Amino acid sequence: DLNDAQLKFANDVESRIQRRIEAILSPIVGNGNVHAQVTAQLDFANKEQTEEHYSPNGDASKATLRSRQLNISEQVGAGPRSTQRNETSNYEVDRTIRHTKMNVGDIERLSVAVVVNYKTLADGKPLPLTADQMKQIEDLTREAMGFSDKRGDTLNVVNSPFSA
Amino acid sequence: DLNDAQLKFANDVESRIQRRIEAILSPIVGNGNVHAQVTAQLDFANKEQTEEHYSPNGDASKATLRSRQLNISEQVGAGPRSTQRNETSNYEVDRTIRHTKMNVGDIERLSVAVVVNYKTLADGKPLPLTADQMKQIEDLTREAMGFSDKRGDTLNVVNSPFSA
Amino acid sequence: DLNDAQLKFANDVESRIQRRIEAILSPIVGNGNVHAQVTAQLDFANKEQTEEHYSPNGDASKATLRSRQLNISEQVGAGPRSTQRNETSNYEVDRTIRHTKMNVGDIERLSVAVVVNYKTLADGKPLPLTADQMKQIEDLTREAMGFSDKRGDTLNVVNSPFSA
Amino acid sequence: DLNDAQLKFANDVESRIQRRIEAILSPIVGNGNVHAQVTAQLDFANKEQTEEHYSPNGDASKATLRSRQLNISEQVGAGPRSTQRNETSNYEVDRTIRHTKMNVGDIERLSVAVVVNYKTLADGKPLPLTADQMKQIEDLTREAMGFSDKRGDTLNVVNSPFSA
């Protein structure tokens, strides 16, 4: 029931990422000379979070006060000195409440496998690509897939001649 | 259901960013001599936040007072001196409450992949572009995509001859 | 639903900024010899704010009083002196409450990309523009776009010959 | 009843992982020259979790205070010294409540078995593949299956000639 809807959601996301990669990889490598497939680890767990933050007021310069009683006594007779300080302070503090409801269906970790073809010249020899072109393909695929390191995304692009 | 609506929202945003990039990249590079694709990491999490800020009043110059009782006693007989100061102060403080409801569907991180063609002169030789022109294309794409560093936007523009 | 309305709002704002830029850039550079595109980062977050400000009254010259009790005693017998001052003061303070509801749909950051053509004389040679003319175009575009530094606006105008 | 629905859910997930692997393994190894089967250990246990986190306030620099009473007495007569410090502090602490409902049907551990064929040249000799090609197949399968180490995923790809 709901599981099938989630699976179809994942399939559509993967297909659209695949198409976005293919769109940029087509003009330079050529139609059919590139194949990519995407798998997506998604987030279907309902989470609700409330965050409370208090600004520190331990420093007297940023401390906000409402009432303060400072009783000071010094009975000098060091000799028979007698110092007494009774201090009472009531503070008002900064407060920030944030309520967050995470979206259901977010992407947790995306791994993408891309395979490119060789280059057959007018003679027909399948000449492999170069390192610079491979790096360009890797960068383009990283851009298309929305590659990020916090998610833990992995990308692998290899070059090999396609079968007949 | 709602996930499909969010996905269509993302697709429309990406398509419009793509079209905006293409619009400026067309007059100089030429029709079809430029291809770009956009992916958008969006924000579909409902957040509500209330912020409270208190202006500090620790300095006597900016401190606002309502009532103040200052009892001072000095019984000089340092000898048998006896100083006593009882101070009570009630303050009124500046207060700023901000209530914020973040919009659903905002952009978190935008990464854009742009590929340009080579230059075929009247002879037909695919002459590659220059560094200055590449920098101009990068700047134009950054302007079109709304490039920002707080979001974490990444842009990659590479030059390569298009396939037939 | 609402997201589409917000997107159309952004598109209309961007189109009108584009048209305003084109309107002034047309008479001097010429029809079609200028192309500009605008992207707008907008504010669709409902914010409500209440601000309270108290005028400081720590200086006796600007302090407003309602009731004041000053008991002073000096029993001179420094010898066996005995000074005692009990002071109680009730103040009335200036107060300013400001309630603000920010508009939904305001502009946060505007970045604009403008491209101009070269100058083809009667012979037909595409002569590039000059530094003074480029500075004039930059100033005119800044004026049209409502360029501001608090927002974080970025503008890029480059000169390049248009393609056929 | 529900068990059959869960089993069909597992079968669909396994079939889609199998198809994703086959899709990338087809262009290079060839149609029919690759066979893969997937088994999935799934999560059909309803879990509900509430998490509470308190920011530490043991350091006076990050400690937020509401009321503080500090009575200090020093009766010097080390001699007949008498120090007494009575300190009472009321704190306000940061608080974060997270409520999480894990999705039913998540993947716990995925193990995948892939078998590839040999290479029969124009002569017909079944030449085995190379180490580099085997490593490429392993990497592609890891990418397709969403291989992860936290889950405990295991992958085994072996090379052997297919039977008639």
Residue numbers in the entry:
A (entry chain A), B (entry chain h), C (entry chain g), D (entry chain B): 229 to 305, 353 to 439
Task: Share the article's original sentences.
The bacterial flagellar motor is a huge bidirectional rotary nanomachine that drives rotation of the flagellum for bacterial motility. The basal body is made up of the LP ring, MS ring, C ring, rod and export apparatus. Here, we present two high-resolution cryo-electron microscopy structures of the C ring-containing flagellar basal body–hook complex from Salmonella Typhimurium, which are in the default counterclockwise state and in a constitutively active CheY mutant-induced clockwise state, respectively.
The MS ring is located on the inner membrane, houses the export apparatus and forms the assembly base for the C ring. Initial two-dimensional (2D) classification analyses of manually picked particles revealed that like the MS ring, the C ring adopts a 34-fold symmetric architecture. In the intact C ring-containing basal body–hook complexes, the MS ring is more stable and harbors much more clear densities for the outer RBM1 subring, outer RBM2 subring and putative inner RBM1 subring, which are made up of 11 RBM1, 11 RBM2 and 23 RBM1 domains of FliF, respectively. The more stable MS ring in the C ring-containing basal body–hook complexes indicates that the C ring is also important for the stability of the MS ring during motor assembly.
